[model samples]
Target: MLIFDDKNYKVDTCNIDGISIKFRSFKEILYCEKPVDSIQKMNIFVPEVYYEGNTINGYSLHTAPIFMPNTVGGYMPGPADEPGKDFKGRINSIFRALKHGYIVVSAGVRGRTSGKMVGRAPALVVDMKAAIRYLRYNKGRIPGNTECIVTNGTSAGGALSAIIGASGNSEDYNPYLKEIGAADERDDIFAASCYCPIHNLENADAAYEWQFCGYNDYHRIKHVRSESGVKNIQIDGILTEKQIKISEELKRLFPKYLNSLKLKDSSNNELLLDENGEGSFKEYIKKLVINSAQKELDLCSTYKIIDNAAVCGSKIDEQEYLSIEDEKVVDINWDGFIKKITRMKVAPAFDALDLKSPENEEFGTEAIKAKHFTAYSQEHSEVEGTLADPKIIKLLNPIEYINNSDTAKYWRVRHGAFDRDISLAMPSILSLTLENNGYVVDFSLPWGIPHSGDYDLDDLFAWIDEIYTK
Candidate 1:
């Protein structure tokens, strides 16, 4: 049995930017009862103030929400993050949460690259749930309130974070958890904080194509810093006719999949699309983009909108951009906005035609190295392939399990406006669906950001503090 007690921890201090942070660090606690891999351990850190019976951010040791953060990117093995510098060598979120009186439980889970068939479909999520159950099983022994756990992640990690909230205490994960000897306790979380999440994989290809189908040439910008300043180098690629045709085909399949969801807007009106994919649904997305642009425009004094297009001077900022005009609410429509954003991948994004995407490898079993998770990809596969098991596909997708599940009460989702990793439609649909189901969601596409998370930790912590106080 995995035992969690005060004896397991040692007093540790992290000195960053000349600020000292003291915490009780419980290192390398295996969350699963029968762990299949070495990466299944989770680390817990409680503020030293908790032991002093003091409070920070109005949260006591027993009442402070547990902040769970993951370092999962590209669906690779993530072995619990710590309170230190991140990939860019700056202080990370674990320290920030500790300063805010939130107990940090950094979860480590297997992923697509864990080993041969060890980290595959549902394994990562299953590991996360087990960690949650382990916390609940220990109950009062742990410093933080397990009932108020909030998950945080970016990209692939973000998808799993959303899943942790959306598919809480779901029976679909029961057998797998049991196999790993997970604690007999609920794995439901109180909230989820997803940043630029790449989820809804089965439908991601279609959604990606729907957003950037007709637009062919793709541009990638790299920032190189020198003594003078930073310079933006643009690299461009063009898709072949075959790939362009495939993009169209994939795009045509999106409306049918979307309309079947039976989603609704804030006013409770059904959002749907037609054969040509033009309708209230597309308009609804356009409104979101308009609102995002409007927010940006509000920040600038030298912005204009002519013919529903933004035109501004480059002297305002380095990245020369404009937004919605204040006079009238007229903003660029869907087609117009599509021309601005660059497409990241070709044809099918998640499930590649050659079955080479990380996601393709994610769905593989011990016997198979890789397989297509989407039917469209499977049918049009360049190499001979079979579709991944339907059950496994559903297991990784939160959309399949959100209904009738113990979902999180509060959600904070951000898909960066400039992020081309996946379509903004994925996050848009996710947030809207959560709202439609009566959950609180704070969703946005922040301007001038791209494919990242933990960049807005203050905003995220504020959101969590606001809800927990209420």
Candidate 2:
């Protein structure tokens, strides 16, 4: 038997159906036969279990499930190979949950420290299901009825927990049965609670832009308009003949930056500068390219061909390039050069690029439309649309089995509030669809969170409490 307590906790070994399991427990369990003071140090209760001939039973209080606070330990392959330092906020939150009479299990899912990308979703869920099975089959130790099982997590864990809830039916979302042989244990959750949950991929992308690129600021995209609210600068009015001439000249001169030809002697050997004359071949080439482009643009402007070139050369400083005149020059003429250069300065090029499709439409309208944002919305829409192919759906769904019987009522999902990297909203939207279909869901969301591992213990506790009671 292994015990985990203190700041860093780990378990060396355990065997279930010939599979060796190594994990870390983030809580402390204290057992009592009778009811004790609610304010007592320990509050959570675990069923009795037999370990090496000893009967283990009692209420165990564990740490809050905040994995890593200040480091990259939030995801696997964190900054360091080991787990993150402890956090008081997490510890207090777990204490609060236990104080409220809940049994909390903080299993270090498959990739708390390493192998995160490959082990994150499916492996974590499998570990969670295994833990649930341990709680159920080890009846003599920390015994509890299988009917009351509820799983809860925050942020990334929350998303995972929610996925578990929504797809927990064996016939629905179990990835193991289709991949590895089916295990004897089941992986279903009963109820879920999420806060500030992520719900759509596009929405998540928008949120990411707002966080990193200042996209939410009105000043960023707002246009100065006339008194009648019409835009002051029209596309045609913005691009003058002078600007066009200048742009063409600048394009022609840009190649001067790279050396097109090297001076050579009759012997075909490279020529060298004399000692009195000081000049770097590379620097000359670079200056030639840059200055030539600027000079050309200046000449073009003089000839009324192109617009301002030198002033707007830096992409980040070229806000004016988004004006109506520039838009006309780029869009009307289908000038990929202007569009590409201008977009690079503002944010990610993809954000501002106009890659319109023929079948654009509002979300939830129809699955067949090119603009429907989420798979769930398309699947549940009133209009016929492209739903997830059965093969893809089976791969991503969760599965649940109990006592050799399939139970479809319980589901669990976990998501990261700061998950800017992946589309966190899609799962929430899917969960909503599942709930509408009559499954009890336990959804967990970490709030005021950055795309980091920092978690709110208070929110985590509240979420678990809601799930436990439900």
Candidate 3:
């Protein structure tokens, strides 16, 4: 019977910019009874004023929102993000949240490489749900408002964040939750903030091909082991004719999949793609990029601007490939942006040809190390007859569960403008999906940013404050 012990905690202080902030820290509390691994635990940090009935930033423990930040990256098993300084000597978000009078619950999660029999698809999200349930089971005893729990993560973890918010309190996860002996409380959350999420993987390949089919060269990060250590080497090459043909076919599949969703804009205008994967939807995406670039150009004065056009010497690091000579900022279109960014993956990014990608490994079973989760990849798979169960694939997708679930009402999703890890269509579709379902979504494609997160904490915390205080 693993339960939260409210009284057992250590008071600690973190120095941020010479300001000493005090908080109570609860370390490594298991969220489940039938935990298969030691990573199924969570750490909680509470502002000291929580016990004194005082408030910081107009939020007390009773009123402050609970924030959960996971440290999972590339779908690799990792512990919870600890408070205080990270590897870069900067104060992590846990302490920042504490300083802002928000309760921080950092949960450890299993990932693709956790073990042979663990950390598979839905397991990572299941562990997250258990942690949330644990907090809710002891609602009044906990320091923060359990009803206002908000989750945040980056990249693959961001996908998990979106999924958690979308599938909250859904009965589809009941068996796994019960098997792990998670507390019999609701697992729904109030809001979610995702940064550069590489999800909606089922359609990611098609969307990616549809966006960058014209670009043939590909660059991907490969881990090369040397005598010293594993080196992150960027491997680049041109796509073969067969691969290009596959890309074209995948590109053709996207418009059909996208049009089938029947998504609409804020004004209820249907966003659709034609046979060529171009329409109001494609134009809308281009507008988003243009707006993002314009915002970046407006913020920095290093560039010579005339008539809202950036000169060649603007020095945009994210768009090093763009050597524009007095380009009209607002006139930049999707193809122009697409030409500048390098495609990060080959054909069928997630569901790999040889089933060697991290995502392929994510859907693997205990017996199989990797399997294809998408039909296109499975049908064209080099390693044939190794397909994941469709039910498990659907379980891992937020699009499937978000429609009829107790999903989070508020969402803040951001995918970087220059991030080519996957297609921008993934996040765009996700945002439109959430909005179409009547959820309040604040989605953005930040300019001059790459595949990263927590770069805009000031903006992030501000957004959180505005939402929680409202």
Candidate 4:
């Protein structure tokens, strides 16, 4: 008589027809009928059957397999790299689901390969789709009844879960569809549980910062650049040819004195020594220096002045030239210089030259406003809030992209608060927008969580139950 108990029911690993799988089981006690008056009064029957085989009619007693995919958490590469013992948190979450009558399956996703990093939203979503296919196709191994499927993860895993929930219905977003040759299997997930999930790439909030951003590659960039100034620093990698050209121009304008200084040694004496011996070469050099310095300064000043005038209806005072002795020189025609700078800075011709004008209406406005706002609001707003300004609505409206199928049901986002890593504040805004769009979205706020898997085990289970029951 083999007695199935907790000590005997350890997780077993096996390769079923080339596919690796892991599972565990328990014994189910049953009562048998017997003649009560004839001395056969009590009879107890214990059946030795696989947990999956213990069912009512055709349906299993379990709710269905809940797949918990691997997340890039802590200092670990993937679940396979970490010892099986270290997955206590994940296993605990799974056990909770099991206690509620669920068959839980946690597996490493596609990005867990040697030296291969996790893919973006689309790729991660595909790995989830494949995991689902693995369970459904391997009937004898994974059981046939997969009536309800839910994907759970935290931080990076949460982001992937959000992507799966959003893009579940769309094959284009699933990267593993063609690999397993199960492209026909619908990737639609019934529900998802994300503890502090990351929903959108464009906007993120504080919770995201705590969970995913601190460890993110882009977090350093966010810190270096001021919030307002960071807009000019594109992280999307979606710059157009013209936008690239403008950036190149800005780069050129940045180090304006390098070329002039290089040319100074050769051209100095020749250009300074005029027809008269009375001409002071030093004075001429000083003039040239002033002119060159003034040109760059004027360009910078002009860019700012016009941008301020256009965006906020304010006038900037023209920069004045100071004498070599540090005295304020009145002959500089400061007002005229400002006017000239404004004209050139706000010239419609510059607008025509900017390649992103048609697609990005506020690109020019932002560039111009960036200068003025940086001067006064430098400590307060980084890039002058041109992208967020209500007045610039028509110019800075966001472009729509492909959305996930489950986006209507869940509002997912990732962040880490240590450094505003996930740009926290965007998901709540998106949640409001999604609600306005008529979709019931559950926004997960996992605070102090890293960009990887750092979720409250209990909270994650509760969220799963809430969504499933609802």
Candidate 5:
């Protein structure tokens, strides 16, 4: 598997949507010498149309931007994406890019389900960084311009994508990459395209309860594979009285954490907390939510959106279900929000002690299936005897790398009001750190969307074009 030599990236041809396109593709190409499993291979798709002076959909191969896409959801192990129809019959993005004459790279790496510590915690991230190095190492031999490579993913993959952009070329990850014998090249990417990134592991629970503590009865529907291999749609649970109290405890704690973040607004003023613990920062967030709804607000003279003033006290709204008043968003009353939410995970959601949560498995070691990544969770866990290694925990968090000056210069984050799988605080903090540091950030928050991806590819691809062409 160590043989990445001149023989790779050879020119080949594949029919993309009835159009026979020439390309130089190398599938199942190993990115590093020490892959934890066979899934550590990457599949590359290069468009040769431009080299032949051809144009498909107005995109030339030489000028077309490179797209590096990952298919990691729930932080689960999966194979590299190939050109074909996705589950819903829509042609996968790779084929769409191919039809438009762009190079695509879909890399597979170790995930939480990759067995024990072999693919846990930092392993997935390390494999992704190695894939980037593989791309840069191949460079001109692979066809497309590696300098304009763009990364995209959903949920857990989205988390890695955003962090990869924010942690590029930093020396902190050098040892991890070296341990796996990754390609000795720059691992930094050009830009990031993240959708509902479930990152900021150690702190996600506080942020989740902070945003929706008022909606106790609010329910969300999600698809799950039952033991019989049938796809079933199940609604999340209604919070019990004890669960409500637990939510209260975590929600109140969020204000202190938010204050510690030291994030700032565009005006360079410190975002502050009042005596009540909700002040300038929540005010700042309110504006962002309102601004996010400004587009929907434009469509109707009377529009419904999350009203921050309505949630002044952050009290839990006790409504079984409130009427949608032209509902563009929310009111933020903790009780009201709790009523609106059908809870997904148990208390201390992200790192539940029963070791059932995906994040717990994410921090697992070779000998363990799951481990607590946060001190608070570890202290509270029934599985508390063994703590996750501090170094591994730091490596898995993007916030830890925001201080690195070599972080990606461009970022595109989209976590719509519809996305409930994670907290708004999740992406908000990441964006703040990047923006405060003078990085170009395209922060998109749709007013009425959920945990989904590729909704607005036109605008996104346009953004990539703007960056690459400039």
Candidate 6:
């Protein structure tokens, strides 16, 4: 923000909406750290419509909402989302903004890794705030309204977008940002559009267990370095008695957390995240799932919700994964959903016995490569003492800041009903918390969608324009 030289951008061209538009791109511009912390950079794409003083699709670039998208996944280090394909070779988040005359500010932040082991825990979210601060710092120079910046990302990035939107300019990130020399400007955003966010790490294992208990028998994979300095792979579905014991304890632990939130339903009834049997929270969730299916195939014997929870499929199904039907909206069959959604990790999903968890690496510092971030994992870990820093864990969780701060004015959250990567409860709890906090939260459960983002780009963009613009 305090760049001595006058701020400027490199003129360029980007293809959005199949209509190429001349743009001004500020590429690889460092946002923080005196030692050039973590390849921190940003790319700001301004549509030519701004300079032309013409409105395309009823929006002028200068007056458009700033779209900040990041290319981050599984908390891994990745580059800024360029105007091209994503890691999965899928088309990156584009159009709507540019096509309709808006600005795209994509940031390239750091995340978990082995080499330097720097991009862990709050690092990514911290990088996120720094970039936001930079945008706010240069709002005048930038072609969009920094006050209306909307963050967008999928999975880990989605989780990040949530934390970023909710946390705003909380002083908790002060020391971290100061270390990186972030711009002395506010990091608060106007809104956030998160897709299938993989979040609530500390409680994810418990939530997953409570949802998929007795269902998953899928093998978990591991990578370790041998004494000979060779990497080895380990895979097994069996859980040790201790792991199973911990999983059960974690599963039972979820209800207390759910009840603690004290969320409400669309009908103003107290949500039963805690005691579902006695409350409608169960039914509410069931309806959410049914709606998530977005289609009615009739409640038949072919696809049935046996008992109250577990799905009992009679024969081969055309849908990739449908653990429930008709009776929908109110459930999770811990196992069927796991297989249907694909269990990616073993028991104690986020905090693994092996410090090899991506989340464990996420909490590591420059010197230490990994550490346990959760109490369940920490108690079981071989690492002595409370080695994990509690600060970042608190900072990374949206639950830590939502009600406590003056966060973004709005939120657009999307979690695929079939996305088993993280518990659907994560998004549910997040949206509920934000709604309870009086923020405008537009939460969606897109049926049949998997752990992906931008799949509903058309609707998403329209929503963005509706809120941010006229």
> What do the candidate models score in CA lDDT, each in turn?
0.84, 0.34, 0.83, 0.35, 0.73, 0.72
Q: What is the TM-score (0 to 1) of candidate 5?
A: 0.86
Residue-level lDDT of model 6, residues 288-387, one tens digit each, is 7655553433443334545534343322233434554443423344335456655555677888777777887777788777788777777777555344
Off by over 4 Å in 4: 1-62, 73-92, 112-122, 138-141, 174-176, 196-419, 444-455
| Arranged by lDDT, best first | 1, 3, 5, 6, 4, 2
* Displacement of the residue 155 alpha carbon in candidate 2, Å: 2.1
**Which 10-residue span in candidate 5 carries the lowest summed lDDT?**
312-321
Of candidate 6, the 10-residue stretch with the lowest lDDT total is: 308-317
Give one digit per residue, the lDDT tens place, for model 3 in 1-470: 76568889999977877877888999989889899888888999999977888988889778888999888878888687667776545788888888888999999988887755688887898999999989888886888899888899999889889999999888889998888888998988999999988788878999989988879888777554445455678789888898998899899999889998999887788999999998999878877877777666555545554444654433552464333344436355355567667788888767788888888888898678888888888888786658788888887788887689998999999999878888998899889999998899999998768788888888888888888766
Q: How well does candidate 4 match the true structure in TM-score terms?
A: 0.42
Error of 1 at 249 (Å): 0.6
Candidate 3 — what's its lDDT?
A: 0.83
Off by over 4 Å in 5: 1-24, 55-63, 225-229, 274-277, 300-344
In terms of TM-score, how similar is model 3 to the real structure? Answer: 0.92
Runs off by more than 4 Å, candidate 1:
220-235, 302-329, 333-336
TM-score against native, each model: 0.92, 0.38, 0.92, 0.42, 0.86, 0.84
Q: Tens digit of lDDT per residue, candidate 4, span 1-470?
A: 11212343445543423433344632221111111111101111111123546642223534444534445331122331211223332334443444433555554443322132333123334445655555444444343245456666664456455555555455343333554343245555665554444344322211222122112122122223242343433342334454444333332221221122222222344222222211333243334334434434444455656665532111212334333222223234333332222211111111233232211221223123211111112222323333323222211111121142444254433233221323333343334344444556555433223344434555555555565556
How far does residue 193 in candidate 6 sit from its true spot (Å)? 0.6
Cα lDDT of model 1 by residue, 1-470, tens digit? 96687686789999988977899999999887798999999999999978998989789889999999998878888898789887666789999999988999998999887765788888899999999988998996888998889999999999999888999888888899999899989999999999988899999998888889888887776655465566778767898998999999999999999999999998888999887777989888878866676666555434543343455432222232333344334646455556657676777778988989889988888778899988888888899998898988888888876668999999999988878988878998899889888899999987757777888889899999999877
User: Candidate 2, residues 189-267: lDDT per residue as tens digits?
Assistant: 4554333333232333322322233211111222343434455332212323543332233223222311222333224
Per-residue lDDT value at 376 in model 4: 14
